[PDB]
Amino acid sequence: SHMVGQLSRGAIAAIMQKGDTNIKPILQVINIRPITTGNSPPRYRLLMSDGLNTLSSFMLATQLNPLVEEEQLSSNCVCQIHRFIVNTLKDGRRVVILMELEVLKSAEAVGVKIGNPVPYNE
Numbered sequence: 001s002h003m004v005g006q007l008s009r010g011a012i013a014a015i016m017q018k019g020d021t022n023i024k025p026i027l028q029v030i031n032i033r034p035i036t037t038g039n040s041p042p043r044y045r046l047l048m049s050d051g052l053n054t055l056s057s058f059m060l061a062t063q064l065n066p067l068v069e070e071e072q073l074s075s076n077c078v079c080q081i082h083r084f085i086v087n088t089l090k091d092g093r094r095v096v097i098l099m100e101l102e103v104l105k106s107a108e109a110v111g112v113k114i115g116n117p118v119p120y121n122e
């Protein structure tokens with residue numbers, strides 16, 4: 001019960017504003033899509049939720065591609081992020097690269113979007 005209490009509420013704002021990387025937040029995957037790479041290996045963009053907010057500017061490190069390609073990491077799964085870095089683009093947007101993560105609960109075991117998160121603004 002209280003499914004939202006499974007997620008690190010407030011982590012998205014903390015990552016995007018304080019830029020603290022010492023945290024190991026538990027987030028839900030809402031959606032995953034490949035992004036166009038020329039002839040580079042595939043790259044995945046994730047829409048993640050901390051229960052309060054969603055954020056669409058997560059990228060998976062390519063070393064984690066098999067998680068997606070063998071379907072252990074998919075929409076609705078709950079993951080703990082163990083290592084990430086934030087990079088800021090020339091235009092001021094920030095991207096969060098997920099380097100290490102652990103799936104705590106598979107999509108099948110969660111089965112739904114937790115809570116009613118709203119998009120994080122900027």
Ligand SMILES: O=C(O)CSc1nnc(-c2sc3ccccc3c2Cl)n1-c1ccccc1
Nearest residue numbers: 034035036045056057058059089093094095
């Ligand atoms: O529109 C789509 O379907 C793909 S989304 C997307 N595609 N390329 C990027 C870019 S552009 C760029 C330029 C310099 C360094 C990193 C990136 C990244 Cl990385 N993003 C991107 C931009 C902001 C947040 C997340 C991904």
Ligand SMILES: O=C(O)CSc1nnc(-c2sc3ccccc3c2Cl)n1-c1ccccc1
Nearest residue numbers: 043059060061062063087088089090095097
């Ligand atoms: O795959 C991995 O194991 C790591 S992927 C990765 N790690 N740092 C980055 C960088 S360096 C950098 C410099 C300026 C603006 C954005 C970025 C980004 Cl962002 N990327 C990155 C570079 C190009 C495209 C997407 C991500």
